[PDB]
Design a protein around this ligand. Sequence first.
Ligand code: CLA
Ligand code: CLA
Ligand code: CLA
Ligand SMILES: CC1=C(C#C/C(C)=C/C=C/C(C)=C/C=C/C=C(C)/C=C/C=C(C)/C=C/[C@@]23O[C@]2(C)C[C@@H](O)CC3(C)C)C(C)(C)C[C@H](O)C1
Ligand SMILES: CC1=C(C#C/C(C)=C/C=C/C(C)=C/C=C/C=C(C)/C=C/C=C(C)/C=C/C2=C(C)C[C@@H](O)CC2(C)C)C(C)(C)C[C@H](O)C1
Ligand SMILES: CC1=C(/C=C/C(C)=C/C=C/C(C)=C/C=C/C=C(C)/C=C/C=C(C)/C=C/C2=C(C)CCCC2(C)C)C(C)(C)CCC1
Lengths: 132, 170, 131, 164, 185, 146, 165, 33
Amino acid sequence: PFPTFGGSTGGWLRAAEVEEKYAITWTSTKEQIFEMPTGGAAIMRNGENLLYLARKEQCLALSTQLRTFKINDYKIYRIFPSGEVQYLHPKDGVFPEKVNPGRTSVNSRGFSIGKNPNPASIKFSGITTYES
Amino acid sequence: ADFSGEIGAANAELGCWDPLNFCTDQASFDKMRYAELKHGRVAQLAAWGYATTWSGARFPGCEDFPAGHEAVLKIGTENLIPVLVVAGALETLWKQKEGSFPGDFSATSFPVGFGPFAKTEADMIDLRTKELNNGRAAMMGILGMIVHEQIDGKPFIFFDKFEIYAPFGN
Amino acid sequence: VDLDYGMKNSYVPATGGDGGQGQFGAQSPNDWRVAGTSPVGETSYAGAADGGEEPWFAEAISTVSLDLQKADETLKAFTKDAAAFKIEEFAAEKPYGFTSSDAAMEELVGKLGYSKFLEMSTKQLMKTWGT
Amino acid sequence: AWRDEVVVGITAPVGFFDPLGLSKGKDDATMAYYREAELKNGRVAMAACLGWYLNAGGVHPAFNSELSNDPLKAMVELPAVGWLQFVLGCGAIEWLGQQIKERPGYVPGDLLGASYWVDNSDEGWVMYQNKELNNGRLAMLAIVGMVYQDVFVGDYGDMMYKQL
Amino acid sequence: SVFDDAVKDWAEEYPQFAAWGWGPSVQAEIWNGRHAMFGWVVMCACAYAKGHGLIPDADQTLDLKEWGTLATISGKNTITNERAIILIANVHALMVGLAATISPNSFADTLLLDPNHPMYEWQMERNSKLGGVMPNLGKMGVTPEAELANGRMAMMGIITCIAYSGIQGQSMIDTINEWVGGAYF
Amino acid sequence: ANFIKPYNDDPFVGHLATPITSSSLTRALLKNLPAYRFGLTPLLRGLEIGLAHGYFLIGPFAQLGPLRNSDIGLLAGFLSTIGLILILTLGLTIYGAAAFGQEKSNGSELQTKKSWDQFKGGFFVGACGSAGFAFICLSSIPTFAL
Amino acid sequence: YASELDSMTGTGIESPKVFDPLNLSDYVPVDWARRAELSNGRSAMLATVGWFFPKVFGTFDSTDVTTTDPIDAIMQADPQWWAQWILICGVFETWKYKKEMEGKSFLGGADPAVDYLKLWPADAAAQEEMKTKELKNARLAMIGIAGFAANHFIPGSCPVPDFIA
Amino acid sequence: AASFLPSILVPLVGLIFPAFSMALFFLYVQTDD
Ligand code: CLA
Ligand code: CLA
Ligand code: CLA
Ligand SMILES: CC1=C(C#C/C(C)=C/C=C/C(C)=C/C=C/C=C(C)/C=C/C=C(C)/C=C/[C@@]23O[C@]2(C)C[C@@H](O)CC3(C)C)C(C)(C)C[C@H](O)C1
Ligand SMILES: CC1=C(C#C/C(C)=C/C=C/C(C)=C/C=C/C=C(C)/C=C/C=C(C)/C=C/C2=C(C)C[C@@H](O)CC2(C)C)C(C)(C)C[C@H](O)C1
Ligand SMILES: CC1=C(/C=C/C(C)=C/C=C/C(C)=C/C=C/C=C(C)/C=C/C=C(C)/C=C/C2=C(C)CCCC2(C)C)C(C)(C)CCC1
């Protein structure tokens, strides 16, 4: 289900084969030309499409472009060398910009930025003021 | 038909290199093979002889004769006739062994054959191939020499004559 | 699917100045520091791809890929809890002739697929499961 | 059968050209040797032609332009060390070529391995290949003609188009 | 004083080097000893040549033009031929040593103990049973034991020669000649 | 006709199959080079590589060095080459230690500690010997004149 | 000494049992030793002849080397000869490698690596006997070349015929 | 003689010492205790 592309010297390297790799998938209603983050132009297929990239940002950048084409069914995965796959985005099925009941707060401090502790107070502690 | 199996094939791919299709059937091939061998053996001796003489060596009683084709033209025919007589006799003596590769004279009166030189079949094929190949080379060589002799007088092209190192012969 | 495969890495968070393993782990379990190319008929990066007659460009031979079928499974596994929360709330709001959470899930996902199910409010779900 | 498959080399002026029928009973291997020889002999001829022309013209800016403009005289003037390098270098390439030939899928004459990207189905490819062959065939005859002129007639320059 | 303790302490303080056999180890004792034994020959040869005037054109300095500033001791002053020749002889030997260090055989005693060399086990074993204060007789002849004993002897001699030379205020070459009976000179 | 295609038919890998990258000539040359050739042992691989690199290195030093015009110029050139070989050998040793570690198992894989050590040794012998060969050859240069 | 020696060619009439008084077999691997024994021996066999051949039977027609003393000629000979000599030896060494890899043997194995005269016996019995003769001649030659050199530098060290010198 | 020391030590201090030191640092920073 690979989109039609002729190849580039800006594709993935060894890290994709020995450390980690990424993959995005989407469905289209027409064959159209899009610009790939790696560099160049490609033609998507009329239906399912799969593409591999080396960075999550590269994948999410393409998603932005896809939204312009009115495609909002994209999914991003991380494939480890052993074959293990992790579903990353949309994580809970709902885009992050939309509040979804069932998501808990993380890394939240209940005070204004100016209420953090003084650096000297936490000296020889190992923690930082913003983590204190 | 397929003479690729025959000894002396150019190489595995080309098989038998017969550009003009002289050979058509086994009968012809045998004829051609016999001829090639005869010419080859004769040539191998010829090159040896030409070089020896041209370099300067002469038999007792032949110290004033010239060398090269010039000899054939100048030296007395009477002293050349012996060659024909000693060759014609051999022509009669050599006896081809029936049911054997062209040029096998094992059936000759005097003992002739692979004797102690060859043991396994492969050894025989090797020796045979080498005889043929060296003959092929000499055939070209003797010509090359004679031609150049006529062209410039230098039968060896790069040098006038050979110098031998025969310690025991001294 | 081992949902902790990524978390199970050699990374050890430091005291101060580190966000941590986050949600999906901070580093790949595997070490990128593998060797270079090898002579014909030999392998270097463990489960590497044989370069055949071009060992020099072996690293360009892909061996890591995503199976579309397998892709479905990873989607379901990593989103299992979310689905659970969703159906639970639907159950709490007095479902019409409710049966079993799982049963309801199957019915509700039989229609509206699965992705659509994950993106629907309990209200919409109840409307959908009115029948 | 080579005759039933060959496409390159057959052009318009004469079509298939074998008046003496030197390829009637030859097998594919022999025919392959012939094509390879044809191309090699021709390609070398083309190069030789260019070399002769440049030297004759006087554009031989090497060795302080010491060597003669006559191409055949110059060869004699060249030190042997120069010739040895030439033969040995060409010999090296010949070895590599043999390696390529052994590899499966070898198309007689292809050392760049263009078979990997293009086949004879493409007319453009076959046409361009024909141009190499045709020019090579002509060059072969030319180099033989020029040598005659230099060795017998006594000239090593154009005696045809020189008269404006 | 127990020797063993000191060696242990060194290993602890400098573990990385100790792993390869560097430092106060049997390996070092063997190799350094072998070199000292060999040197004695070189030093005696030098003495003989000096006394018998064998070295060609000694007491003359190499040309600063033929050779370069590398041959200068101070300013334009250059090294004498004798010292140069002695050095070249040693360089011949050092080259052999470098080859042996960088390109060891499969049945050779490597300078350092390498787990990936086939002779590692034998070397480890030999070293494990070659330690003592007194030479172990009964293993005379060509044995690892004899080698170590002779090596220690040679190394001690070097120390003694230097000391005696200083006490008597003489060159080491002179002391050598003296201990031989004045034969060389 | 397109002479440039995606490498290994993977449109997303960062490489392309150009005539330079994948031609019979390039493939043949690289396949038979000592580094990638099939069957060569680690030692032999190093030896061939060393023999090749040592022969051409004596030149630069001998003809352009500080003592080029001296009668002992060629000798000096040889010594200089040996010095460079030693530096390169140190590098090889150090690389192996860091890249491969301390104990190995696979064996006969240029990419292991034991194999690398053997490779390094071969390089040293070949390089130094090759330089010596050049010294002998450059001592008397043939004019090839009849 | 190493046990394998008991099952190898080399022991004979003048040496009924394994001769390794200093047990060098313990250190040097048995295989390498035999390979080296033959290599040094074969080379020595050739040297012996070369030590006197030029003197006794004459020299080639050239003036590069004027002396006949075996040692002196080493430096008189043009360096180009020496380079080519190293090359030919390298070629020989390569041949032994390639042919050995083809299963052939240059150490008394079943398939000869170099038998241009085609005189390698087929029966193992004769093969064994043939190998023994070579080893002997080799050992004798090594001793001889050493002896020649000895008398050359330290006169009287060995009883060498005058012509051989 | 002490006068020879400049020509015996400088080669070592400026060439041998720096090399070994750099090598050791590399091995130290490339090792994973
Ligand atoms: C190296 C020489 C050489 C070789 C090997 C070939 C080989 C081939 N040519 Mg060819 N050709 C050549 C030179 C050569 N050509 C030249 C110089 C011309 C220009 C006139 C042509 C023009 C030509 C045409 C127009 C056609 C061919 C074709 C062919 C192929 C089929 C015909 C055949 O089997 O010929 C067999 C030929 C040989 C086995 C070798 C040639 C015979 C040698 C050269 C004998 C020398 C004769 C000659 C008179 C020597 C004197 C030259 C000079 C001194 C006057 C075959 C592969 C045909 C083809 O491509 O079909 C696929 C085709 O249609 N050729
Ligand atoms: C970068 C430019 C440059 C160049 C070309 C030179 C050139 C030279 N310097 Mg110099 N130098 C330079 C910068 C340069 N210097 C700088 C910046 C300094 C200040 C630190 C010095 C300080 C200096 C000193 C103090 C001395 C020199 C010396 C020398 C000479 C000895 C050459 C030598 O041993 O190299 C050895 C070279 C090599 C081992 C390798 C050369 C590179 C190879 C040939 C590249 C091959 C690439 C290949 C073609 C790729 C394709 C391969 C494929 C076909 C298979 C030479 C004339 C010495 C001398 O006598 O002066 C004349 C000397 O004593 N230099
Ligand atoms: C204190 C440090 C030091 C010392 C003692 C030297 C000494 C020398 N340099 Mg130098 N150099 C240095 C630092 C130093 N350099 C630095 C920092 C740079 C970078 C800018 C250079 C760049 C440089 C260049 C570019 C050149 C020199 C050259 C030379 C030599 C010229 C004299 C001579 O006779 O050449 C003639 C050469 C000889 C007689 C050969 C001597 C034998 C060699 C040196 C043996 C080396 C083996 C050595 C032990 C290997 C090291 C192993 C490793 C573990 C350290 C001389 C040996 C020139 C030369 O010829 O290099 C050899 C040259 O071209 N140097
Ligand atoms: C203080 C202390 C202790 C101690 C101690 C003591 C006594 C320590 C003393 C150690 C001592 C004194 C060790 C001598 C070494 C001499 C060497 C290595 C000579 C090498 C010589 C070599 C390598 C020869 C080289 C040459 O051949 C070459 C290279 C070139 C030739 O031209 C010339 C020569 C021949 C020269 C206790 C009590 C034991 C334990 C306690 O806890 C700590
Ligand atoms: C001593 C010395 C010097 C020297 C020196 C010396 C000896 C130098 C030696 C140089 C030498 C041997 C160079 C050798 C060159 C050999 C070549 C190209 C061979 C090509 C073979 C080919 C294509 C084979 C093709 C095939 C055919 C068709 C049939 C097929 O079936 C199979 C197959 C077999 C594959 C110098 C020159 C370095 C100068 C210095 O100062 C002094
Ligand atoms: C441009 C080009 C090319 C290339 C060229 C080149 C790059 C060359 C190089 C070359 C080289 C670079 C060579 C080398 C050589 C080397 C040698 C030849 C060596 C030798 C050595 C020896 C022989 C030995 C030694 C020794 C040892 C081993 C040790 C002991 C001692 C002795 C001494 C024995 C060609 C033409 C292909 C084609 C076109 C392109």
